[PDB]
Symmetry: C2
Subunit: 154 residues, 2 copies
């Protein structure tokens, strides 16, 4: 996959966490050829469609990380992933994906995003089922790890 397409999602993530949670996550080594390995506790998932193109984005969080994000964004920690946390994950998925859509639209890449889906489950794995090009990127802090996966056809 081309880097100028990938970066805006990676940059939106870091920008959203920086401006909203005063949090600088550390990007790790990307994986360009295998998903359904990295475990998470809550995930935001969103589909994308463009002219002759289709794709998908997922942002997966370990429980300790998302609860600390809640704590910085709303001043209080819920103890466990509850309904309000799933809403935060939905909103974060929208901000990461929307911020990427604006930057990419200036570069000539146009797409519409679907409704986000939040999955809650202890140690679930995500797999983007497509013959397209994929990228998985870990982002770590002392409070846990987040995984962003972007997939596209066309």
């Amino acid at each position: 996959m081309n880097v100028d397409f990938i970066n805006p999602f990676l940059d939106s993530l870091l920008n959203v966490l920086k401006t909203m949670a005063n949090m600088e996550l550390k990007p790790g080594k990307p994986n360009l050829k295998k998903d359904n390995l990295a475990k998470g506790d809550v995930s935001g998932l969103i589909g994308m469609v463009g002219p002759q193109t289709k794709g998908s984005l997922s942002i997966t969080f370990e429980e300790t990380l998302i609860l600390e994000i809640m704590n910085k964004m709303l001043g209080e920690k819920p103890e466990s992933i509850d309904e309000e946390v799933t809403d935060l994950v939905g909103e974060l998925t929208n901000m990461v994906t929307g911020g990427a859509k604006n930057l990419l639209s200036d570069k000539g890449y146009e797409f519409d995003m679907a409704t986000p889906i939040v999955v809650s489950g202890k140690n679930h794995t995500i797999a983007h089922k497509s013959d397209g090009q994929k990228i998985i990127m870990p982002f770590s802090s002392i409070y846990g790890t987040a995984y962003i996966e972007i997939c596209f056809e066309g």
Copy 2:
């Protein structure tokens, strides 16, 4: 929402399950108000975008049900949910959505679909984060329960 919009998704689910494994599931009473309640072990998730509209579909299976579906097609149960099983759930998800896409095009409802995502994890729940109308319908059998959620706004 519209029963004319929802029905094509429900019919495709039964048609795809019959075509694949001769599996007939019984529909139960749907929830039209609240999601993030039904639990499952493997789910297919796919976004939808039409002109000035956006939506999402998820199909969730209990482990015993999806492994029996596998058993009816191949002659043997896989023991756990693996890549073969997640590949099947992604295909079932595309076929259900594509089948509905066609029935709905004849009626005037048009949309394109994103790439499907498959989630694996014991007892995970699903929240479609939208202001639109939602339907979560159970489909039961002697081998366990499947849930289909359709969400759309526009």
